Each structure stands twice: as C-alpha cells, then as structure tokens.
Symmetry: C4
Subunit: 150 residues, 4 copies
C-alpha cells in the first residue's frame, strides 16, 4: 500500500502532471517514506519514462541524489522536489524499453563484424553495410532529443 | 558565522557576483568548512535557481566533486566557480511548491493509480495527443501547486 | 564473445540502433559482464562520438553510475539508454589525433613555455584579439595533428 | 623538468592550440607520465582557464577521469585526448580567480543580510538592496557562457 502511493507518484510523472507529482511526493514524505526508495524510482523513471526524450534527465536526477546524500532532511526536500518536477515536465519516451523486443528475438556474427574482420568498412573512413544477421527488422521505436537525432 | 553564510546566499539570490565573492572570501579566511559551503550551494542550486536552470545542480555538484579530488589551494577556484555560477544564473523558487502540496496533505489512492491497477492507461501506449486521466484525487482535480516563472517556462509551454 | 562485442561497437559506429540493440541483447543473454559492456561504451563515447558531442561521455558515465546503484533487472534500461544514445549521435574519430602527434614524438621545451618562464605571456592578460605565441617547438610550427569533422566544427570555426 | 612539459601542455591549452596540446600530451605519455597527474591539471584548467566561458567543462573533464579510472591504458588514452582537446578548443576565461581580489580586500554583516533578518527583501517575492558592506567595488571580471549571463 505504500507501493500504491509511489505508483500514483510515478504514473503522475509519466502523465506529465507536476501538481499530482508534488501531491503524491508530499504524501510520501509526510508518511516518512524512505528517500532512497523515492530516488531509485526517479532514476528508473528518468530512463524508462523520459529516456532519449532528454538524455540528460539521468544526469540531473543523479546529481539530486548525491546532493541529497550529503544534505538529508529538511533541506534535501528541494532535491526531491526538483528531480520530481524535472521529470514531470520533461518530454516523454519509453523507447529505451525497445531492448526487450530484441531480447525476445534472441530467445552467429556476420564475418565483416567479427573482431579484426578483414572486410569491415569503417564508417569514419568514409555507407551500405549490414549490421544485423542475414536472417534478420526494427527494434527501436522513437516517440524531444531522440526526434531530432532520428 | 551563520550571518556570514546568510549574506553569501542572499548575495547569490540577489544575483550579485561581487558580494558573492566577498562573503565567500570572508568565509574561507575565517576557516569555514568547505563541505558546509558546498551544502548551501547545492541547496541554493535547487531552492533559488531550480528549474530556471536545472543544470545548476549538476555544475555545483561537479565543483564539489572537483574540490574533493583537489583540496586546497586549488579547490578555492571550484568554490568560486560554483558560487559565481549561481549568482549569475536566472532565478526561480518554483521548487518551494512542494510545501504547498504538503499543506494540502496536512488521502486514498485512486484505484486506477494503484500498483498494477487493472484500469490504468499508459501514456506511452497512447495513440492520441493527450491522455486525459486523473492523477490527483477527484476532490482536488484542477488544483494548482506549481507555476513556473527560464527553462521551466519552455517546458511549461509545451 | 569478443566477436559479439565487436559487432555491438560496429553497429554503434554505423549508427544502427536496431543492430545495436540486438547485439546488446545477445550479450546479456550470454551472461556478459555489464562493467565490461560499459567500458566499451565509455571508450566508444570518446573514440567514435568524441567531440561530435562531448556530452556523450557524461551521459554514458551517468548510465554506468545508474547501473551501479540499481543493478538488474532495471539496470538493463541504462545499458540500453547508453547504447542507443551513442548509436544515434553524430560521429567523429578526431580524438585519434593523439596517435598522430605520438608518431611525431617517436624534443626540448621552449624556454618561454617552461614552468615559471620569465618570458611567458598569458592570454588572459592580453588586451588584443589573438596572442601570437609559439606553443609547438619551432621546427614544428604549422604542423597539424587535429582537424574536426558537430560540436567540434563550431568550436573550430571560432 | 617534467614540470616543464606539463607547463607547456597547459599553456598550449590556455592558448587555444589543439595541435601543441596533443603534442605535449603525447610527449607526457611516451614518457610514462602519471595520468592522475595529467587529469588533476586538466581539472584545474577546466576551472581556472575555461571556467564560466563554459561551465560544463569541469563536468566533461571529470567524466573523462572517472572513465579513465575504470579503463586505464591503452584505451584510456582517448579520455586524456578528449578532455585535452575539449579544453584547448573551448572559449577561455580566468574570471573564477576574481576570488583572490576579494581575499585581498578581506585581509561586519549589514543587518538586512543577517540570518533571519527582519528587513531582508527576498528577490523571489518581487530590486534595490545592498549586498556589500557600506564601506564597500567590483571583484568579478567577466571576459562564452558568462558573456550572455552578464
């Protein structure tokens, strides 16, 4: 049941609602919830829910955890609030979970991709060349920063 | 001692790099613990700059780490970089919002927002433009805890 | 094993996110050490992306730190973020330059460039537009070890 | 005398010369110079020579040291080269040394700046208010990012 509050909190972040985020956040801290337990979920969210929409999201959130470590309560509340608000208002993407589609397919390396392959063409020196095996298909599904990169 | 550190943070909050430097210099002559100064700088990076530039906490944290690796005398420049950086950043106190919501708390979880809820819809699966779903309890929908004033503006406008 | 990791780095170098993911997935099914994968990702962030985006090393390092804090199963997403991020970044091998200069070495310090040199002039004191001062030995002036190809371009143009 | 090489290396960075930087860099590593000794000077340079011209310079350089730690030679050479090139081509400023002018002057807090001062005006709530003592003057001398902030 405190799993229910942190769930409401993370779904609020995922839904881009900074008000509900703070509300569930305040709920957890009036309840004396463990801050490392909040931070671990923020980190995961920074990569599972924001991810390549803003690839510096994990950087900001880690700085907020480190800062919290040095500082603790009552002041640390600001790190919790910045990191929570920061994820709530960021653009969203779950394209980092594309790894699971690839793990499903997995469940032999082309020659040109072998270590010290003799017929590898280095893209820096220059491109058509195949990176998947012959018998294989799109695993990565882009949805922010990843849009421009795409 | 606690007045000097106060004048330091207020000069930063007031966007005064010169006074910022003067109270920093005061503090180190007087033997103040650099870890203590870095605590207040980390705090002020979220409390006084905050989402006006959420990179501020990364830069200051990295100044703090640089100081742990180098120590004095050269550590004095990382105190100075961190301090100057906050003094000249745009300011916002919007992270103080959490206290507003905390006052609203001082509250059951809606069913669709519980862990593993069967009626929860996931914005990542959503083929539309905005998933309309309740995130606050019903008696509170519409209530506003956060408004931005820099980087928070742009993010808000989207 | 060393062929799989090779195909992984080459897919990243080739800007292929799909193949990148497939060889990542291959590696973790096979039990590959995540620290080993992160080493190659840190390396590739400087060798293959490099000054095309010097933030790449910060992001990947931070993925690595996130993995140390979280471990599996959720650590798999930080491997994935780091990997995908390099696959889609602009590429540059311009940090390989150091090997060129290393070949020129395989050499006394000019006097004005020695520690505490009395004839050294400091670009920070310089009231002009560009301090013309020798940084290479005289028999080497004009020689070029680095050319950019992204972020390195802009920095170069200045 | 290996102090002479690292000096040539740092002055080359300070002079914005990426070629000479690499040259002295290669010199230090063919000599088996200690990489922590190179990195410590890069860090200092990232703040004393680049500083607020690019305030993420210390971030990049620290990531390059951490990466080097995990990896070592021969591959680590890339972290050394990226961080060295990165500082060489960055815009330059020594405005972080302005702290020493202030330490010279130092060698009593206005009331409104005291802890819990009754007549402090908070800039968030709103500005003319004095941050230096009455008897005091410009310490900070901006020269990149600090230009825009100024």
């Amino acid at each position: 049941n405190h799993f229910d509050v942190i769930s409401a909190f993370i779904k609020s972040i995922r839904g881009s609602d900074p008000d509900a985020t703070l509300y569930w956040l305040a709920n957890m801290v009036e309840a004396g919830e463990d801050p490392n337990f909040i931070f671990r979920r923020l980190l995961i969210s920074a990569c599972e829910d924001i991810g390549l929409a803003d690839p510096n999201a994990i950087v900001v959130v880690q700085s907020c955890c480190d800062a919290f470590d040095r500082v603790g309560f009552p002041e640390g509340l600001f790190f919790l609030s910045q990191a929570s608000l920061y994820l709530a208002i960021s653009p969203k993407s779950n394209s980092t979970k594309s790894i699971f589609k690839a793990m499903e397919a997995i469940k032999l390396v082309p020659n040109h991709l072998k270590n010290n392959a003799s017929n590898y063409l280095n893209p820096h020196n220059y491109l058509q060349q195949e990176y998947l095996p012959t018998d294989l298909i799109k695993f990565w599904k882009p949805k922010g920063w990843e849009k421009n990169k795409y």
